[PDB]
């Protein structure tokens, strides 16, 4: 689902003809970008909630 959203967002960014002179939509763009970066960081750095007592205890 994120792939199509990124595709359309980037296509809109690169196809701006009468969509220039903006101040806050780019801010929301970086907000979404850093939100996705935090998503990826959380998935790659998922610590183990339960204690791994099978091998650690």
């Amino acid at each position: 689902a994120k792939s199509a959203a990124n595709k359309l967002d980037w296509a809109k960014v690169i196809s701006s003809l009468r969509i220039t002179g903006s101040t806050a939509t780019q801010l929301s763009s970086f907000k979404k970008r850093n939100d996705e970066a935090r998503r990826q960081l959380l998935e790659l750095q998922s610590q183990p909630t339960e204690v791994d007592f099978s091998h650690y205890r």
């Binding site: 792939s3 990124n6 595709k7 690169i14 970008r33």
Partner: protein, 506 residues
């Protein structure tokens, strides 16, 4: 506790058995000591390079066997040993524990556990001095080693089995690039395919104990200690420890290599090993050969680094990639020890101090850093993009020197000069930042294909991050295709071209 009691009882039973068996099979009386070299009488039929037990407890080994007197270099402090001390011989050549148990453990030159984490479990004991594999057992270097530097280390690779040198002055990044390579090997040794895992082994010879402690701390911070052996001899112990630690690291490396596994060994700052051999030879009665260096320094470098090789499929297809490091003075690569080690290795990586002071943290000079795996023993994606980029960068440097010589059709008007300067600014990296091979092709491809003419030198640093984010956010298709295929085909080349001239406008 319970284990010390039974361990002590068993070992002292073995000690009594040894004392009651064959007397001791040879002894000797100490004639002289000093600087870690000890003369001793007796030992009439002592083996060459044989470990010997001293009454005080210090270990020894036989470099010299004179008529009557025996040249023993002392493995440890010479304070304990005195005149007349009985010198029992162990009955075997100098050995070191080798096996999978050394993973995650720090040991000395002799292989004894020094990290205090417990005993070392070794499959066997290998001689510290082992003849290098022959021509047929050796194999052409074809398997890449992922350096993870996003620099010339990628365009001109290392590969599995090369002894790629790392020359440069002190505090230029030699240990830095070594540790970045070790960290980058985690992505491949964290899986299950043993044919791609690179079980690293560090040689921190001539390194202060605080520095090696910080190094191992950084290793286990990034979960790199699980596959790295830190067999080394710090500056605290005697010169023979420094001389033998890299050789026992080589023994561990061959054990990994002879078992079909792939191991990366970094001989960090062999200069202290050479000067430790100097210290041995000065008082072992071996006259120096050249420049106060005994002649056998070249031979010892030869035997130590030629053990590093890529085995053939008959021998198990193992690899023993070596990363020798030398600390030169003032960038003098024409000094003796440089000349030997640059002639002992398969290419070098120059790290001049001026580039480090300029701001380039890798500080690698493209012009002199050569290798024998140009567009070979690489991933394939990087080898097609930059198979001959080093020569182009060297010519860029020469023309830029030529450009400043006289005002002509040069400077920004030269496409070659612009491409070379943009690529040189591209080849940069921060420490503790291992970059995978997939996020390295687009940058070099943009540099080589003349797509960086209108990006400006100052903005290339931001362009790198923007382009990498572009791939990792909305162009992961071709990036993952390159990563999984390990090569860029016509489809992948077209996709990368699409990405690069779509993002050239930004």
């Amino acid at each position: 506790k319970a284990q010390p009691t039974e361990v002590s009882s068993i070992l002292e039973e073995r000690i009594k058995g040894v004392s009651d068996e064959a007397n001791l099979n040879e002894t000797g009386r100490v004639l002289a000591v000093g600087d870690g070299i000890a003369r001793v009488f007796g030992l009439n039929n002592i083996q060459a390079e044989e470990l010997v037990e001293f009454s005080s407890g210090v270990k020894g080994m036989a470099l010299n066997l004179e008529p009557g007197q025996v040249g023993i270099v002392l493995f440890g402090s010479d304070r304990l040993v005195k005149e007349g001390e009985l010198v029992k011989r162990t009955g075997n050549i100098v050995d070191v524990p080798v096996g999978p148990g050394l993973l995650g453990r720090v040991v000395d030159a002799l292989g004894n556990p020094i990290d205090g984490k417990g005993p070392i479990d070794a499959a066997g004991r290998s001689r510290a001095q082992v003849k290098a594999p022959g021509i047929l057992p050796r194999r052409s270097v074809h398997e890449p080693v992922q350096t993870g530097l996003k620099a010339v280390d990628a365009l001109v690779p290392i590969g599995r089995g090369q002894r790629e040198l790392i020359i440069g002055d002190r505090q230029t990044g030699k240990t830095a690039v070594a540790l970045d390579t070790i960290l980058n090997q985690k992505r491949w040794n964290n899986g299950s395919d043993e044919s791609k895992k690179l079980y690293c082994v560090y040689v921190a010879v001539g390194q202060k104990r605080s520095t090696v402690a910080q190094l191992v701390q950084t290793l286990e911070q990034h979960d790199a200690m699980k596959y790295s052996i830190i067999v080394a001899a710090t500056a605290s112990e005697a010169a023979p420890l420094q001389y033998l630690a890299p050789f026992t690291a080589a023994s561990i490396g061959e054990w990994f290599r002879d078992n079909g596994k792939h191991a990366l060994i970094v001989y960090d700052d062999l200069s202290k090993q050479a000067v430790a051999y100097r210290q041995l030879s000065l008082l072992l009665r071996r006259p120096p050969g050249r420049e106060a260096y005994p002649g056998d320094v070249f031979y010892l470098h030869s035997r130590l680094l030629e053990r590093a090789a890529k085995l053939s499929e008959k021998e198990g297809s193992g690899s023993l990639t070596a990363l020798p490091v030398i600390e030169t003075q003032g960038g003098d690569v024409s000094a003796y020890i440089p000349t030997n080690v640059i002639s002992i290795t398969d290419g070098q990586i120059f790290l001049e101090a001026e580039l480090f002071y300029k701001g380039i943290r890798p500080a690698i000079n493209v012009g002199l850093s050569v290798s024998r795996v140009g567009s070979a023993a690489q991933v394939k994606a990087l080898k097609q993009v930059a198979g001959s980029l080093k020569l182009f960068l060297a010519q860029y440097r020469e023309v830029a020197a030529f450009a400043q010589f006289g005002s002509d059709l040069d400077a920004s008007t030269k496409q070659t000069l612009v491409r070379g300067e943009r690529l040189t600014q591209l080849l940069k990296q921060n420490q503790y930042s291992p970059l995978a091979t997939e996020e390295q092709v687009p940058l070099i491809y943009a540099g080589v294909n003349g797509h960086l003419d209108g990006i400006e030198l100052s903005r290339i640093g931001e362009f790198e991050s923007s382009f990498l984010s572009y791939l990792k956010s909305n162009h992961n298709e071709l990036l993952t295709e390159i990563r999984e295929k390990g090569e860029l085909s016509k489809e992948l080349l077209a996709s990368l071209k699409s990405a690069t001239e779509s993002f050239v406008a930004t």
